[PDB]
Design a protein around this ligand. Structure first.
Ligand SMILES: CCCCCCCCCCCCCCCCCC(=O)OC[C@H](COP(=O)([O-])OCC(O)COP(=O)([O-])OC[C@@H](COC(=O)CCCCCCCCCCCCCCCCC)OC(=O)CCCCCCCCCCCCCCCCC)OC(=O)CCCCCCCCCCCCCCCCC
Ligand code: BCL
Ligand code: BCL
Ligand SMILES: CC[C@H]1c2cc3[nH]c4c(c3C)C(=O)[C@H](C(=O)OC)c4c3nc(cc4[nH]c(cc(n2)[C@@H]1C)c(C(C)=O)c4C)[C@@H](C)[C@@H]3CCC(=O)OC/C=C(\C)CCC[C@H](C)CCC[C@H](C)CCCC(C)C
Ligand SMILES: CC[C@H]1c2cc3[nH]c4c(c3C)C(=O)[C@H](C(=O)OC)c4c3nc(cc4[nH]c(cc(n2)[C@@H]1C)c(C(C)=O)c4C)[C@@H](C)[C@@H]3CCC(=O)OC/C=C(\C)CCC[C@H](C)CCC[C@H](C)CCCC(C)C
Ligand SMILES: CC(C)=CCC/C(C)=C/CC/C(C)=C/CC/C(C)=C/CC/C(C)=C/CC/C(C)=C\CC/C(C)=C/CC/C(C)=C/CC1=C(C)C(=O)c2ccccc2C1=O
Ligand SMILES: CCCCCC/C=C\CCCCCCCCCC(=O)O[C@H](COC(=O)CCCCCCCCCCCCCCC)COP(=O)(O)OC[C@@H](O)CO
Ligand SMILES: COC(C)(C)C/C=C/C(C)=C/C=C/C(C)=C/C=C/C(C)=C/C=C\C=C(C)\C=C\C=C(C)\C=C\C=C(C)\C=C\CC(C)(C)OC
Ligand code: HEM
Ligand code: HEM
Ligand SMILES: CCCCCCCCCCCCO[C@@H]1O[C@H](CO)[C@@H](O[C@H]2O[C@H](CO)[C@@H](O)[C@H](O)[C@H]2O)[C@H](O)[C@H]1O
Ligand SMILES: [Ca+2]
Ligand SMILES: [Ca+2]
Ligand SMILES: [Fe+3]
Ligand SMILES: [Mg+2]
Lengths: 277, 318, 41, 63, 50, 259, 311, 50
């Protein structure tokens, strides 16, 4: 079922691949070629994860507990080759399916953008999240030389991976790109709360008042911090902050081990050893 | 390529807007507004004016006192050597009172200065909250920003005041320093058994991740429909244009459901607010009702088990 | 189009080679002396 | 008659596209040789690995 | 100089007074705090008078 | 009091469960807010039922909220009943979910990327009640920044490179000072048409405005303004939607697929 | 900035990310800087005994004269190659104890023999040699004294932290973990071993002190925390590695070395071998390890010298 | 030089005044702080006069 204003937008065409073959909607979803590919990439990957949970690390430890299900990457001894299915090969197949699903999702978004005649900012922004995932499971494992460097597929198990990778550098907070990425993450959250607040407070003002104006919006933050970025620019800023956070997060992890093996605080010794002090 | 609306190609100049008139009796806005060309490239060119009222003045005075105390103690920690101050600046800090002092006021260099900096900074933040409330009230606006700020203040108070009082120890609180407060963050997680297994830490991350996801989604969405005037969201809320329709239709086709031009900002507001709400709750639960988060996770079947390929003989079991 | 005529390109690329070959010449003798100093292969 | 590529691809994009691709490929292959200890020329022509004796091991025990 | 009155044609007295009072206050706080940080001049901990 | 509620239940476990109940209510609230526009849904389920089954999903719709507009422009209800609008298109196949093909010239069909809702036939207003989007010839206090080129006089070029016209005036937003439209003197007819800044790519060196959306010939059919010095919210949507239709309709290859 | 790939050693389950990363070129330089000394040729069997010939031999009594001479040649290369036998001996008089270096080195023989014989839970058949610490220097390069931290104003109590120090691998953690943990026996554990609070009143600040010690341990061995821990549960010995058990004994071994061998030698030692607080140059990790997971990367030198084991 | 008065025709007299007054104060503060950091030149902790 479509929105009450949607029918006049359900136009034929705008596909990247497939033309009229898959150019249709299933319920609310647009399918297209990459809807078919993406759905069955996701369906296979999800089913393989369930199968990976069905056999578990072994029969004794096997669990369907949603927190404890974990599909682990191969051992590092397998290098960049393919591992047996029960020894990390399933993880490698799921990773391929995940890449297939994520990219197909982005390309399906491109076809939707073409149908609606809008900018391609959303698929472009989604590519940053995909790029971060690709860095974690492809770029970094290849730079290190083994698929086993990828994180396991498990709701809690991949937190143990993050924890131990962080402590492979003894104090991960000192990673400079990590510090930059967190600053962008924290600033983005602050900017999002500010933007959500301003729009809501202007369109839902005090009782007995009419809807406010864009003049009120500029004045409000000028009255608080002396500057207003503007109605258009806050969306530029929000996109910039979120994308910079992910870009620098991708940088921080890809330099942690491939381009830096020491403890992260030791990296700052370049500044401490400047001859000025 | 097509205009991506990332940078303003041709900027427009008008007389500086003084701002929407304030209610009678309010103080005038200070600062002669100026235009910055580079600020206008990405956003608005006008800088200023600002409203610096009675509340803002007190917040600034309280805030400077706290900041001056912190920076003075950092300088004292390097024995007044300004060169060594610059070299070690990231490592310097005003450090909380020692564990043996409990909640009592210790001598100045043993936590006394930290308490003053903590109190003065807290007062300035609280006064700044009143300022954000007053600025919205003076413009006839709702108090969404002051609520969201109060949520952030709740987390801030949980870190440095409420949790230390509940543990009865100022030594639990956060040092005033760049690397020192990162050391505190790591030590907090280590001390209380891997904060990754704190479910409210999990929730806070989900909302922090969601804040970036939503602003990337919403920021890209508005820019994608800004060719239809999607940036003018008040217009699209009161008079739904093709920008709001195409924005909603894009997301309905992508993920089967969508928001509205107004409700997306409610999703945004709550996602950011819940980041600090659950962060505060997770901090308040840690060390008070949960000692070891990993062991709490084991008790509740959250922590996965791994095959024992490596193990250590426990020397205490001898 | 880059805002110049056919005639200008002749003389611009005419001595662009001259500036290029002189810079290459300094590079070559630098590598020759570096090799004649300590070989790297 | 091989000009037709220039009737369907702009000279400028291809030349910049070719340069970026060729520079990236050359950087990539140069890095791959540096990746291999056999072709790592940055180690020097008379590079000799350290001799290990008396039960020495370069790496700690693995898994 | 007999004409040292002419600086105020260059700088606003309101601005110059706020800056001077603010700077003198911080300087006064800093010197007092340096002396409190010095064991030989901390008049509150020196134990004098006993 | 203590941390242990039962032998197994503890305070942290209670707190996390309490959040899940609040969060469930919050998601229900947010989804209801999402549904203030475009609901009940346009569905075959309603069509075969003769309108007896309104498609709302879960949660159901919220009670209408009130937006009081400034300057007595009126009051709008966020959940509102909207009259059905016919579409200038026909289904390309008779199965559900099939797309529609526009009727007539797709650039003039008002369907697909060229579709737009009918907004109010009133201009967006500044806080002082003046029209917000106006030409530079009536917003006399506004000017182009010195470091940026003046759009006026630049040659407007369509997607094919052919010259479409020249920039006569610049329409600016009087609330947030910025360009929103470029008034183009069409080379063919001479009738002035608006060109949104979002469809204009500036070439500062060449003093050209490149419009990839539509060809030079398509400029003659851009919807025109009733009054020459102002634009209603309805007209703004009509103009922007027309250029957007060109992103899919202007050239045959723009329909796709690539390969 | 380093060039990938590193040499990676997996120590835990796949996907747990318990791995050691080594830059191959940095590892190469470290190995070249930590090469063992070749053992002397074995002494001729039989011959006159130490007790019959030498008067003032109190430790190496069970030796043959050939083996005893071999030991003196060995320790000369290990401790004072640039100074010769006269570094620890009065010239002309072999049996005289009238120089502090002989009194110290006699105690150092006991330190080595006790280590090789009673601390195999740590040194495990590899043992130690005077070279392991001294490396041909009379003063071992990597020693520690009680650190006052940076100078402070006379009325300011030091925090002992918030200062970039190589001792804690350039973090702002408490920069003197040697004194509480490697000389004194302060409790290192800070983590509660129950889900719900049960009386562990350990402060968060004490966790920073343990973190500082582990930063020094990891830097001393050139390893990361996952060499001995699963960081998801630092406390848990079941999820730890066997090297954590060895490190536990090493801490007690270091405490024994400093308390029972170095500290009682303080009066014999000159002022140059003492810190600002007056404590002697003390042994920590990195005195033997010097940035390697095993001293000299596990080179086995002590087995060739019978004088380095208790009778 | 006899025409050294010609500098102020190009640089604004107010902005240079604010610059030198702030710079000298910071320089004076920094030099004092550096001297306090030394054991030899800290006049507060040297114990003179006893
Ligand atoms: C703390 C954060 C984490 C918390 C936990 C998060 C866990 C992860 C969350 C994952 C969410 C996944 C679900 C998303 C939506 C799924 C797609 C979909 O169909 O949506 C329709 C669904 C309902 O749509 P509707 O508008 O009510 O539908 C109108 C009528 O139902 C229309 O009537 P109708 O007749 O069309 O009704 C049928 C409709 C009914 O829809 C559903 O029932 C699906 C929803 C179930 C849930 O069917 C569909 O919509 C799907 C059609 C599929 C057709 C193809 C079937 C193939 C199978 C055949 C195989 C045979 C072999 O929309 C949603 O459920 C929205 C969910 C939003 C979740 C957001 C909260 C989580 C994120 C929080 C963080 C954000 C910050 C918060 C502050
Ligand atoms: C391992 C054994 C040897 C070695 C084995 C080889 C082998 C085998 C080869 C090289 C080649 C090269 N080596 Mg070598 N090389 C070694 C060590 C080095 C070292 C070093 C200091 O260690 C350096 C600096 C180099 C450098 C080089 C380059 C001179 C050359 C790569 C050409 C290239 O990148 O074109 C790509 C970049 C271009 C710009 C191409 C230009 C053409 C296009 C059409 C121009 C378009 C311009 C347009 C404006 C686009 C501009 C680019 C974009 C704007 C980004 N080698 C080691 C010691 N080396 C290759 C060679 O000889 O190529 C000629 C080659 O086959
Ligand atoms: C360490 C040894 C002594 C000590 C040694 C000294 C020395 C030496 C000095 C002080 C000075 C001061 N000390 Mg003391 N002081 C000590 C302990 C204390 C303690 C305490 C709790 O122990 C306190 C609260 C103080 C407080 C003070 C302040 C009263 C004063 C700094 C004022 C200032 O910074 O103005 C700066 C802020 C401003 C806003 C400056 C503006 C100038 C004024 C306020 C404006 C003009 C007013 C009016 C218009 C004039 C009209 C003129 C005609 C009538 C028209 N001292 C210890 C016991 N102290 C200083 C002083 O006496 O200066 C007055 C000083 O030189
Ligand atoms: C780059 C800035 C931020 C961002 C942006 C962003 N994300 C996006 C988009 C954008 C612009 C979209 O357009 C797209 C979307 O449509 O969102 C609604 C999306 C999206 N971001 C999503 C999630 C997501 N984004 C995240 C992060 C971010 N997204 C960044 C912070 C995270 C984090 C931080 O964890 C998550 C979880 C989805 C809701 C959606 C993309 C949906 C998609 O690709 O659907 C196809 C795939 C499936 C339906 C299932 C695939 C299953 C696999 C085959 C198997 C499982 C593999 C996986 C590796 C398992 C791992 C599990 C463990 C980690 C627990
Ligand atoms: C939804 C949760 C997120 C959030 C929300 C949030 N933060 C907020 C708000 C909200 C809703 C505000 O309304 C408030 C604000 O004003 O935002 C612009 C704020 C704010 N969040 C801030 C910071 C901040 N938020 C953070 C985080 C977050 N904020 C969360 C991620 C962080 C992090 C990640 O660490 C930081 C650092 C501030 C910018 C602001 C609150 C400002 C405040 O309290 O100011 C107090 C003043 C002082 C301590 C200093 C005053 C002293 C001066 C330095 C003296 C010297 C200069 C002087 C001013 C010169 C002029 C003097 C005149 C007299 C002439
Ligand atoms: C033939 C046949 C049967 C084929 C199979 C069917 C096929 C192929 C279907 C294709 C689609 C596919 C592959 C479906 C399978 C996979 C499934 C089920 C996907 C479900 C979709 C999905 C991933 C949902 C996840 C959503 C989640 C959890 C988070 C998203 C982020 C989030 C919280 C969003 C909520 C806020 C919203 C709605 C934001 C969107 C939004 C934003 C950001 C605006 O700025 C904006 C501005 C103005 C108006 C509206 C909006 C608006 O709606
Ligand atoms: C502060 C610098 C800007 C500034 O100083 O502008 C002041 C505005 O008021 C004020 O405080 C305004 C105070 C807040 C201004 C700073 C706000 C942030 C700076 C702009 C950031 C733009 C980009 C933001 C991130 C995208 C003007 O004050 P005056 O000294 O009266 O006028 C001096 C000028 O007329 C030049 O002669
Ligand atoms: C212009 O400024 C000059 C140059 C003069 C001096 C500037 C110095 C500089 C550069 C200082 C820089 C400081 C920096 C970089 C500080 C960084 C601080 C950080 C990162 C802090 C992070 C977290 C800190 C937190 C969360 C602390 C929270 C503390 C709280 C909430 C404490 C509250 C305490 C109270 C309310 C005390 C109560 C006790 C009462 C009874 C008062 O006690 C008596
Ligand atoms: C049997 C072999 C050894 C001999 C002969 C030996 C000899 C000596 C001598 C002569 C000194 C005093 C040097 C001086 O002050 O100038 C000394 C000091 C010291 N030795 Fe050893 N030593 C031996 C083994 C070790 C080992 C295994 C360690 C490490 C555990 C060690 C650590 C130290 C330390 C820390 C000092 C104090 C620093 C100093 O005074 O030089 N030594 N040793
Ligand atoms: C920088 C990375 C490291 C971190 C963050 C770390 C963290 C910790 C923590 C928090 C404890 C206290 C455990 C408790 O409270 O029960 C601890 C103890 C311990 N760590 Fe580490 N550690 C690190 C590196 C190492 C390494 C490399 C080793 C092995 C060489 C090691 C061996 C030990 C041992 C043996 C204990 C127990 C000490 C005792 O009980 O006396 N650690 N570590
Ligand atoms: C995985 C994510 C998506 C990336 C797509 C590419 C996946 C991997 C590419 C396939 C490469 C397969 O290459 C193949 O790998 C296996 C497993 O290491 C190698 O096998 C070799 O190493 C393994 C373990 O390291 C040993 O058990 C085996 O004795 C040895 O022969 C084969 O010698 C090699 O031919
Ligand atoms: Ca006194
Ligand atoms: Ca003195
Ligand atoms: Fe918005
Ligand atoms: Mg600290």
């Amino acid at each position: 079922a479509m929105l009450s204003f949607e029918r006049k937008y359900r136009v034929r065409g705008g596909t990247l691949i497939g033309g009229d073959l898959f150019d249709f909607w299933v319920g609310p979803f647009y399918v297209g070629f990459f809807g078919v590919a993406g759905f069955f990439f996701a369906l296979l990957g999800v089913l393989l994860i369930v199968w990976g949970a069905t056999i578990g690390p072994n029969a004794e430890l096997q669990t369907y507990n949603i927190w404890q299900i974990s599909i682990a990457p191969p051992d590092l001894s397998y290098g960049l080759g393919m591992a047996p299915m029960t020894e990390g090969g399933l993880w490698q197949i799921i990773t391929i399916c995940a890449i297939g699903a994520f990219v197909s999702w982005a390309l399906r978004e491109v076809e939707i953008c073409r149908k609606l005649g809008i900018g391609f900012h959303i698929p472009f922004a989604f590519a940053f999240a995909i790029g971060a995932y690709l860095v974690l499971v492809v770029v970094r494992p290849i730079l290190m030389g083994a698929w086993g460097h990828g994180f396991p597929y498990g709701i809690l198990s991949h937190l143990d991976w993050v924890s131990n990778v962080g402590y492979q550098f003894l104090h991960f907070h000192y990673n400079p790109a990590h510090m930059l990425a967190i600053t962008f993450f924290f600033t983005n959250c602050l900017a999002l709360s500010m933007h959500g607040s301003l729009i809501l407070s202007v369109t839902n003002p005090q009782k007995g008042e009419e809807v406010k104006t864009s003049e009120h919006e500029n004045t409000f933050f000028r009255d608080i911090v002396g500057y207003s970025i503007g109605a258009l620019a806050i969306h530029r800023l929000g996109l910039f902050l979120a994308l910079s956070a992910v870009f620098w997060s991708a940088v921080c992890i890809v330099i942690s081990g491939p381009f830096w093996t020491r403890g992260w605080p030791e990296w700052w010794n370049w500044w401490l050893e400047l001859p000025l002090w | 390529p097509e205009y991506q609306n990332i940078f303003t190609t041709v900027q427009v100049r008008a007389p500086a807007y003084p701002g929407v008139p304030l209610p009678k009796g309010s103080l005038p806005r200070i600062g002669k507004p100026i235009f910055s060309y580079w600020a206008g490239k990405i956003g608005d060119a006008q800088i200023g004016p600002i409203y610096l009222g009675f509340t803002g003045t007190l917040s600034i005075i309280f805030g400077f006192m706290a900041i001056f105390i912190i920076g003075f103690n950092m300088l004292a920690s390097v024995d007044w050597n300004i060169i060594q101050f610059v070299k070690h600046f990231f490592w310097l800090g005003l450090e909380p009172p020692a564990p043996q002092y409990g909640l009592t006021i210790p001598p100045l260099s043993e936590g006394g200065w930290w308490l003053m900096a903590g109190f003065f900074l807290t007062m300035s933040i609280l006064l700044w909250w009143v300022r954000t409330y007053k600025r919205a009230e003076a413009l006839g606006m709702s108090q969404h920003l002051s609520w969201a700020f109060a949520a952030a203040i709740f987390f801030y108070l949980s870190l440095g005041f409420i949790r230390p009082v509940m543990m009865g120890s100022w030594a639990e609180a956060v040092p005033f320093g760049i690397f020192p407060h990162l050391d505190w963050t790591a030590a907090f997680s280590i001390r209380y058994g891997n904060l990754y297994y704190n479910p409210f830490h999990m929730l806070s991350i989900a909302f922090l991740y969601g804040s970036a996801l939503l602003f990337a989604m919403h920021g890209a969405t508005i820019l994608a429909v800004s060719r239809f005037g999607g940036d003018r969201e008040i217009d699209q809320i009161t008079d739904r244009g093709t920008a709001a329709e195409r924005a909603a239709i894009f997301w309905r086709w992508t993920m089967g459901f969508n928001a509205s031009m107004e409700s997306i900002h409610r999703w945004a507001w709550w996602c950011a607010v819940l980041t600090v709400i659950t962060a505060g709750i997770g901090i308040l639960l840690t060390g008070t009702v949960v000692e070891n988060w990993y062991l709490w996770a084991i008790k509740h079947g959250v922590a996965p088990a791994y095959p024992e390929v490596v193990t250590a003989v426990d020397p205490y079991a001898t | 189009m880059t805002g110049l005529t056919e005639q200008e390109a002749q003389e611009f690329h005419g001595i662009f080679v001259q500036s290029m070959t002189a810079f290459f010449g300094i590079v070559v003798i630098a590598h020759i002396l570096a090799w004649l100093w300590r070989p790297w292969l | 008659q091989l000009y037709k590529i220039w009737l369907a691809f702009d000279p400028r994009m291809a030349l910049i596209g070719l340069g970026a691709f060729l520079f990236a490929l050359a950087l990539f292959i140069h890095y791959m040789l540096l990746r291999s200890p056999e072709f790592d020329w940055l180690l020097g022509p008379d590079y000799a690995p350290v001799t290990l004796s008396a039960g020495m091991s370069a790496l700690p025990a693995g898994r | 100089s007999p004409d040292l009155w002419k600086i105020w044609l260059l700088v606003d007295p309101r601005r110059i007074l706020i800056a001077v009072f603010a700077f003198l206050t911080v300087l006064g706080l800093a010197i007092h705090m340096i002396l409190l940080s010095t064991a030989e001049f901390n008049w509150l901990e020196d134990g004098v008078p006993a | 009091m203590s941390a242990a509620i039962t032998e197994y239940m503890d305070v942290a476990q209670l707190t996390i469960w309490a959040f899940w109940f609040f969060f469930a209510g919050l998601i229900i609230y947010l989804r209801r807010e999402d549904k203030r526009e475009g609901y009940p849904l346009d569905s075959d389920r309603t069509e075969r039922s003769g309108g007896r089954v309104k498609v709302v999903g879960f949660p159901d719709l919220a009670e209408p909220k009130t937006f009081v507009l400034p300057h007595n422009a009126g009051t709008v209800m966020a959940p509102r009943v909207e009259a059905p609008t016919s579409i200038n298109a026909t289904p390309v196949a008779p199965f559900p979910g099939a797309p529609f093909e526009p009727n007539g010239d797709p650039m003039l069909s008002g369907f697909g990327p060229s579709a737009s809702p009918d907004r109010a036939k009133h201009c967006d207003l500044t806080f002082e009640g003046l029209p917000k989007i106006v030409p530079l010839r009536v917003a006399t206090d506004f000017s182009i920044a010195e470091r940026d080129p003046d759009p006026r006089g630049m040659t407007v070029v369509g997607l094919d490179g052919e010259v479409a016209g020249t920039v006569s005036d610049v329409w600016v937003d009087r609330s947030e000072p910025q360009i929103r439209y470029l008034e183009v003197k069409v080379a063919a007819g001479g009738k002035n048409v608006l060109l949104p800044i979002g469809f204009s790519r500036f070439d500062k060196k060449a003093r050209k405005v490149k419009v990839a959306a539509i060809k030079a010939a398509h400029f003659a059919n851009v919807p025109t303004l009733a009054k020459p010095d102002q634009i209603t919210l309805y007209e703004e949507d009509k103009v922007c939607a027309y250029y957007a239709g060109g992103k899919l309709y202007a050239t045959a290859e723009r329909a796709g697929p690539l390969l | 900035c380093e060039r990938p790939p590193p040499e990676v050693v997996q120590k835990g389950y796949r996907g747990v990310a318990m791995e050691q990363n080594y830059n191959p070129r940095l590892l190469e330089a470290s190995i070249k800087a930590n090469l063992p000394v070749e053992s002397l040729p074995a002494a001729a069997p039989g011959g006159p005994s130490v007790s019959d010939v030498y008067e003032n031999v109190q430790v190496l009594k069970d030796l043959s004269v050939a083996e005893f001479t071999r030991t003196m040649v060995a320790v000369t290369t290990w401790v004072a190659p640039k100074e010769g036998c006269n570094y620890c001996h009065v010239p002309g008089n072999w049996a005289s104890d009238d120089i502090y270096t002989k009194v110290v080195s006699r105690r150092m023989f006991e330190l080595v023999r006790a280590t090789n014989s009673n601390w195999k839970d740590h040194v495990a058949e590899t043992g130690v040699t005077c070279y392991t610490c001294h490396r041909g220097n009379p003063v071992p390069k990597y020693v520690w004294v009680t650190d006052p931290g940076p100078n402070q104003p006379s009325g300011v109590t030091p925090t002992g932290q918030n200062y970039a120090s190589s001792t804690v691998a350039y973090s702002a953690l408490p920069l003197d973990p040697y004194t509480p943990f490697l000389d004194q026996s302060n409790e290192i554990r800070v983590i509660g071993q129950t889900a719900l609070p049960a009386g562990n009143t350990t402060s968060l600040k004490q966790a920073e002190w343990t973190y500082g010690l582990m930063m020094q341990i990891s830097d001393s061995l050139g390893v990361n925390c996952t060499f001995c821990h699963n960081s998801r549960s630092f406390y848990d010995w079941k999820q730890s590695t066997p090297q954590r058990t060895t490190a536990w004994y090493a801490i007690r071994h270091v405490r024994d070395i400093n308390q029972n061998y170095i500290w009682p030698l303080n009066d014999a030692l000159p002022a140059s071998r003492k810190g600002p607080y007056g404590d002697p140059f003390k042994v920590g990790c990195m005195t033997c390890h010097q940035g390697a997971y095993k001293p000299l990367y596990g080179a086995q030198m002590a087995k060739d010298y019978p004088a380095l084991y208790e009778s």
